[PDB]
Amino acid sequence: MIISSLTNPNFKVGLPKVIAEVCDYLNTLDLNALENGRHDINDQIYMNVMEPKAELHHEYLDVQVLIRGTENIEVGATYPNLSKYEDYNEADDYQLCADIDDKFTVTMKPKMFAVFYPYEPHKPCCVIKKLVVKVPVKLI
Template sequence: MIYGRLDNVDLEQATLPEAVLEGLRFLKETNLENAPEGRIEIDGDRIFASVQDYDTRPAEANRPESHIRYFDIQYVVSGEEAIGFAPLNAGMRAVEDHAEERDILFYDTVAGETSLMMPAGSYAVFYPWDVHRPGCAVAEPGKAVRKVVVKVRVEATP
């Protein structure tokens, strides 16, 4: 997992993998406040983005998830949310496996989960070895969030 602020990318670019930088450049160069909800093509199925508008919910209302073929760059355009995260441990078993059709696995519980506060302008990179629980309320549920999730195929990493 990597956490950062989009306005610091120029300072941090030497420390980030090129595939992550590709996604962050898209986020920096695109007017995301006015982008329509839905999928935005960046480089076919290798890198694409999804613009999402939703209200935060209590953490227990959101399911922890992981991915196999893609890693996520989750960027909060406006609002704020908490994202739970933890390492994917060998003993963890998915309760719903949609890996083939949607590249997502869901879990009931996650040992050692920590909350990451995501104010507007922040991003987090979640790799296939990370479990994450997005869309959680920071203080009270129902706060509007605009988020962009850039999906980067794992084979795209150097």
């Protein structure tokens, strides 16, 4: 997983070019003015902007970007025990499970971003605006 800030001079270090090309372009947008909903980007990457169990993916990574508020995401980094997982919904790429093993809590502040690769589980629940960029693993 990767957790950094759009605001930090060097956030680009170590990133996969594609997630990098895109944090460049978010830095272009007036993130605050973005309309909640799904915004397309290229032909493969889209965006969902949102304003108010754990989840994981097979096909896409998430780049999460808090834009306003403060948010605690639950996150695991050990590969999940799949056998305990609800099943996969081939339509929205996901499986759910009540729990995360080896769990820790990342608190996001405006600027923070978080990339969870497929199977890295997470759980935006709690304690706002943000967006979540869908990037197909293949592109990395």
